[PDB]
């Protein structure tokens, strides 16, 4: 179902009278807008086009009020201009109040560049759009957000660094990380947040757990106190929400006999 | 049925091998073309991209051959460029011959401005187009040509001028005029072509007829000899074809007792 048509003044191309007023309500499908232009336009000129006019509207917005033969200082004439609707709807109105030929206009549905919406990549197509993510993330079910793939990694070295996905840059939204540090049965590991610590707060909640002992929920803008664990195996959980601008955290683990 | 999709190198985002070659054949509906662009593009560089490449083709036309990471003097890289197919068809080919991540591309069907066809007015819409004419003409059945409305007019004055529709400018195509000069029963009218005479020739045929007596077929580039009729009523027939640039004719009729 293609959308396009033609509109003309009463009695076109003959002279129009002043006992017939007109309106046309044009509708394109969702995702489209309508473009209209005039091939012939000849209406009497009057201050602010109050006597004779062609008015273009979208919803309550008044896109334009036309009249005359040649645009002036306070009255506008279509010329060869193209008018676009705001939304998939356009209303054209023709009025005349008590020698002019009137007008001929054409309209056609046209695609809307809907990426004028997405977390990472916005892909536009005819009638709609969709989103995609960068390498390392996977589109969420909200179809717009990019969840990070931050789980399944483990640390075996005596000491190492951990952090939020894009540290020191805003971390993924609607993500849920899970970091792991596994060491020999003897050793004992101590964690201490380093550099910066920035997490959305009022707990975006960072939780550190290990065989009987819960830490957190951590949030806020300052390095939380250092933590001396018991185990040689610790797991960290960082769940996020949509808030973007938050640098995140970075932990430097270490262990001793 | 909306057209759009995604293409990637073997094993994307992992490094690609060299035992798998690829092609995708994209098809948009008549009236549309496909646009494609790369979100990720990382292929090994080689002179004229002979070892690794992404080739874009439309029919037999080679729109582009890609490779590398950054365009150079003899090798091209997508960058953030957008590629459009020629016609409603696009073919993407990926090759590799014996550390690079490959590529991710997206494509979407897009409308073709088919008024890049018509006699007078070309109107474009999604998937096709149509034609319209200026005031005084009516679209022919070929859906493209503008026939003139040159019939039904009569002349009653003792003397008057007649001519081709846009004299002295190219006359309408596929038109068929019929002029009439009616005078009192007594008078007798004489016709003589004036100014210019330009009609498509080898008879576009101008014929003058009146109660028993046929004149013509007139064509050519010079004023035809003057004609003294018998009747007080004469009718002229001018039929055209597609040839455009031909000024036409102009007759100055007169009559005497
Ligand atoms: C519209 O464009 C034509 C060229 O095709 C130009 O001659 C004409 O002046 C323009 N009309 C107006 C008033 O904008
Ligand atoms: C593509 O555009 C980005 C801006 O978003 C720019 O930083 C990048 O250099 C461009 N890539 C190339 C190689 O054209
Ligand atoms: Ca769109
Ligand atoms: Ca089109």
């Amino acid at each position: 179902e293609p959308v396009f048509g033609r509109l003309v003044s009463p009695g076109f191309p003959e002279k129009y009278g002043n006992h017939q007023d007109r309106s046309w309500t044009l509708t394109a499908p969702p995702g489209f807008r309508l473009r209209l232009y005039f091939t012939h336009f000849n209406l009497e000129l009057s201050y602010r086009c109050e006597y004779d006019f062609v008015k273009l509207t979208s919803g309550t917005k008044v896109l334009a009020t036309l009249c005359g033969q040649e645009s002036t200082d306070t009255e506008r004439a279509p010329g060869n201009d193209t008018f676009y609707s705001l939304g998939p709807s356009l209303k054209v109105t023709f009025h005349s109040d008590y020698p002019f030929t009137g007008f001929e206009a054409f309209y056609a549905a046209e695609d809307v560049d809907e990426c004028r919406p997405c977390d990472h990549y916005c892909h536009n197509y005819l009638g709609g759009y969709y989103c995609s993510c960068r390498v390392g993330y996977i589109l969420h079910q909200n179809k717009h957000t990019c969840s990070a793939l931050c789980s399944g990694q483990v640390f075996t070295g005596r000491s190492g660094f951990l952090s939020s996905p894009e540290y020191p840059q805003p971390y993924p939204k609607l993500s849920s990380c899970a970091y792991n540090i596994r060491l020999e049965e003897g050793f004992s590991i101590t964690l201490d947040f380093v550099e910066s610590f920035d997490v959305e707060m009022h707990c975006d909640s960072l939780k550190i757990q290990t065989d009987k002992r819960e830490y957190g929920p951590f949030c806020g803008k300052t390095l939380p106190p250092r933590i001396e664990t018991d185990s040689n195996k610790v797991t960290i959980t960082f769940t996020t929400d949509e808030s973007g601008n938050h640098t995140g955290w970075k932990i430097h683990y270490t262990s001793t006999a």
Side-chain angles (χ1 to χ4, degrees), chain A residues 1-47 49-157 159-183 185-229 231-232 234-240 243-257:
Chain A
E1 291 184 51
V3 168
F4 67 78
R6 159 182 187 264
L7 319 177
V8 295
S9 39
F12 183 79
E14 297 293 55
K15 57 178 180 180
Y16 56 84
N18 40 62
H19 57 286
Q20 159 173 158
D21 257 26
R22 285 183 177 187
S23 76
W24 296 260
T25 302
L26 314 174
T27 299
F32 302 85
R33 66 178 184 167
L34 302 157
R35 68 186 172 85
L36 169 159
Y37 50 91
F38 299 81
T39 57
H40 183 70
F41 192 89
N42 180 250
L43 298 193
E44 177 161 58
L45 180 66
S46 66
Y47 212 73
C49 299
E50 196 235 51
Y51 291 151
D52 284 22
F53 66 70
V54 167
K55 198 193 296 293
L56 296 177
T57 59
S58 281
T60 52
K61 296 200 183 65
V62 174
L63 314 172
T65 297
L66 308 168
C67 79
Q69 169 65 52
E70 319 158 67
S71 264
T72 66
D73 303 298
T74 171
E75 288 64 59
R76 183 185 180 182
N80 297 296
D81 289 356
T82 293
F83 304 73
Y84 307 88
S85 69
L86 304 186
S89 163
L90 185 66
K91 177 158 182 177
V92 183
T93 289
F94 174 78
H95 175 72
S96 179
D97 281 313
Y98 294 6
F100 298 95
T101 35
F103 79 90
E104 194 181 49
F106 293 78
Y107 72 86
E110 152 176 294
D111 181 70
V112 176
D113 186 351
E114 281 181 291
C115 291
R116 291 183 176 184
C118 303
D119 209 329
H120 287 31
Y121 298 115
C122 181
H123 303 302
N124 172 86
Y125 67 80
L126 282 169
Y129 75 84
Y130 67 96
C131 310
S132 81
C133 301
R134 288 195 297 284
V135 183
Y137 304 68
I138 87 165
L139 185 70
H140 185 200
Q141 296 195 56
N142 61 31
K143 314 286 194 179
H144 293 61
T145 293
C146 292
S147 305
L149 292 181
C150 55
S151 299
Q153 179 176 56
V154 186
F155 299 72
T156 52
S159 72
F161 296 70
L162 321 185
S163 53
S164 47
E166 304 289 300
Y167 199 83
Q169 306 189 66
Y171 45 84
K173 308 164 193 178
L174 286 305
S175 312
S176 66
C177 303
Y179 305 82
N180 304 289
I181 312 173
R182 172 189 174 182
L183 298 178
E185 235 317 305
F187 299 62
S188 197
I189 170 178
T190 289
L191 315 163
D192 41 7
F193 304 77
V194 311
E195 300 181 66
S196 296
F197 187 88
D198 173 44
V199 176
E200 175 77 68
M201 80 176 120
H202 188 300
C203 313
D204 293 53
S205 72
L206 179 62
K207 293 177 184 183
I208 303 180
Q209 182 183 61
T210 193
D211 305 66
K212 287 310 172 63
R213 184 49 185 178
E214 299 142 53
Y215 299 105
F218 292 116
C219 33
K221 215 169 181 179
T222 50
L223 306 177
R226 160 176 180 146
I227 300 179
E228 304 179 302
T229 74
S231 289
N232 51 303
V234 58
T235 62
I236 308 168
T237 304
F238 182 49
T239 302
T240 62
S243 296
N245 277 187
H246 280 306
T247 308
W249 49 267
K250 182 171 185 173
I251 290 176
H252 179 332
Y253 80 79
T254 62
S255 46
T256 303

